[PDB]
Design a protein around this ligand. Structure first.
Ligand SMILES: [Zn+2]
Lengths: 315, 77
């Protein structure tokens, strides 16, 4: 009496698993939450046209679990479910080429996601998670629907939510290949001598305090645990880039002094991001809109700088 | 075994918070939230530049009596 069909189920779109599907039970009763080309089919009973089709399932058992972990580098049970929810909307976005880079046309408050994708395309970074790396390669070719949905899944954000660019970068750089990133900082207090700390990974490339890379190299005033105020300065930096951040203040961007930057108009309840990169002239990329300019002076919150190796001249 | 640490806000002022090094960072954030008026999702804490992940104990970050945690506001763009 039981009548079945043959399908493939997967969690990483590479390892296919052959499955005999009872046509009298829904895909949910047999596999749990199931998707077919993104479309949720958990409540749907098999159709004869589903023969040989590939179905996305969540890692219910042990084989799928390790397979999903090698692909996404996360154990969050709800990750793939949240990835599919964001992907429903991100497939409808438009990714036009702007100034040589893939941008995101305005929709669903994706201006902070637009600044992330733009900044990434100017940095020499790789992703350790194979799902992020494959989706990023497709993103540089104007096919960024998967990459944006993954970014929302790793950041625990949903479509339509306002977002923070630097926070989003922090989540994705955890899955970046920053193993060789090294940063050495000195804390010079006139009472409590000198102090050296070495930072690695994401902490070696990101900094919160000033937008100026030179400020970090000459001296930043930092509180001292003893009670005074000491000066922090960069001793050694080994990475392909650095990211300086600060609360949105008004700042003058000069050509030939930085790689790219993000600016923020508004307050801490609602604002708008636009991206500024440096090619032949200063480019301003506001979603699908491009604007060239000689000078720029506005409310900057993130600034990126190219880097290979820097050693201080101070002692 | 409670001690006291400082949490500095974005205006440059540090309030004292009574904590145990076994309590999680998420526990501390609910105290900073009640004092400064911001709700937890809209800010994040750092100590000597290193961010604090919510569900880890405070003792793993080397917090000393009267250390200064920093409060950073998350933009909404
Ligand atoms: Zn000192």
């Amino acid at each position: 009496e039981v009548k079945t069909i043959k399908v493939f189920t997967t969690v990483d779109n590479t390892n296919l698993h052959t499955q005999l599907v009872d046509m009298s039970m829904t895909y949910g009763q047999q596999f749990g939450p199931t998707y077919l080309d993104g479309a949720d089919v958990t409540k749907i009973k098999p159709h004869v046209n589903h023969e040989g089709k590939t179905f996305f399932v969540l890692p219910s058992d042990d084989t799928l679990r390790s397979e999903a972990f090698e692909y996404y580098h996360t154990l969050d049970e709800s990750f793939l479910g949240r990835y599919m929810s964001a992907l429903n909307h991100t497939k409808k976005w438009k990714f036009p080429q702007v100034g040589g880079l893939t941008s995101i046309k305005w929709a669903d408050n994706n201006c902070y996601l637009s600044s992330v994708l733009l900044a990434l395309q100017q940095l020499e970074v790789k992703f350790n998670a194979p799902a992020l790396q494959e989706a990023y390669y497709r993103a540089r070719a104007g096919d960024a629907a998967n990459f944006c949905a993954l970014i929302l899944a790793y950041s625990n954000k949903t479509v339509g939510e306002l977002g923070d660019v630097r926070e989003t970068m922090t989540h994705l750089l955890q899955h970046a290949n920053l193993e060789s990133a090294k940063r050495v900082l000195n804390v010079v207090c006139k009472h409590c001598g000198q102090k050296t700390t070495t930072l690695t990974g994401v902490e070696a490339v990101m900094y919160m305090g000033t937008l100026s890379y030179d400020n970090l190299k000459t001296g930043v005033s930092i509180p001292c645990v003893c009670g005074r105020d000491a000066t922090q300065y960069l001793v050694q930096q080994e990475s392909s880039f650095v990211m300086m951040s600060a609360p949105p203040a008004e700042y003058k961007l000069q050509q030939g002094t930085f790689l790219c930057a993000n600016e923020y108009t508004g307050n801490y309840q609602c604002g708008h991001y636009t991206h500024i990169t440096a090619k032949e002239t200063l480019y301003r990329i506001d979603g699908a809109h491009l604007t060239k300019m000689s000078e720029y002076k506005g409310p900057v919150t993130d600034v990126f700088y190219k880097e290979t190796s820097y050693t201080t001249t101070i002692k | 075994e409670p001690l006291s640490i400082l949490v500095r806000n974005n205006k440059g002022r540090s309030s004292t918070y009574e904590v145990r090094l076994t309590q999680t960072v998420a526990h501390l954030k609910q105290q900073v939230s009640g004092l400064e008026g911001v709700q937890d999702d809209l800010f994040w804490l750092t100590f000597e530049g290193k961010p604090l992940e919510d569900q880890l104990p405070l003792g793993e970050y080397g917090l000393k009596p009267l250390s200064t945690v920093f409060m950073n506001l998350r933009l909404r763009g």
